[PDB]
Amino acid sequence: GSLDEDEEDLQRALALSRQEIDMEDEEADLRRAIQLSMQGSSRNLE
């Protein structure tokens, strides 16, 4: 039950999209979304 296994590729995809965008304007919002995802924050606000 290695969850980290999938998370390795998941954060890989995140880093992948990081270099895909890497643009500090409008895409910077998507960039911030990767950061948000890396913060482990989903729809679990309340």
Curated annotation (Swiss-Prot):
PTM entry text: Monoubiquitinated N-terminally by UBE2W, possibly leading to activate the deubiquitinating enzyme activity.
Domain UIM stretches: 5-24, 25-44
Mutagenesis / variant outcome for changing S17A: Inhibits substrate trapping
Source superkingdom: Eukaryota
Tissue: Ubiquitous.
Cellular compartment(s): Nucleus matrix; Nucleus; Lysosome membrane
Assembly and binders: Interacts with STUB1/CHIP (when monoubiquitinated). Interacts with DNA repair proteins RAD23A and RAD23B. Interacts with BECN1 (via its poly-Gln domain). Interacts with PRKN, UBR2, VCP and tubulin. Short isoform 1 interacts with CASP7.
Domains: entry comment: The UIM domains bind ubiquitin and interact with various E3 ubiquitin-protein ligase, such as STUB1/CHIP. They are essential to limit the length of ubiquitin chains. The poly-Gln domain is involved in the interaction with BECN1 and subsequent starvation-induced autophagy.
Function: Deubiquitinating enzyme involved in protein homeostasis maintenance, transcription, cytoskeleton regulation, myogenesis and degradation of misfolded chaperone substrates. Binds long polyubiquitin chains and trims them, while it has weak or no activity against chains of 4 or less ubiquitins. Involved in degradation of misfolded chaperone substrates via its interaction with STUB1/CHIP: recruited to monoubiquitinated STUB1/CHIP, and restricts the length of ubiquitin chain attached to STUB1/CHIP substrates and preventing further chain extension.
Involvement in disorder: Spinocerebellar ataxia 3: Spinocerebellar ataxia is a clinically and genetically heterogeneous group of cerebellar disorders. Patients show progressive incoordination of gait and often poor coordination of hands, speech and eye movements, due to cerebellum degeneration with variable involvement of the brainstem and spinal cord.
Protein name, entry field: Ataxin-3
Lineage: Eukaryota, Metazoa, Chordata, Craniata, Vertebrata
Gene from which this protein is expressed: ATXN3
Part of the whole protein covered: 222 to 263 of 361
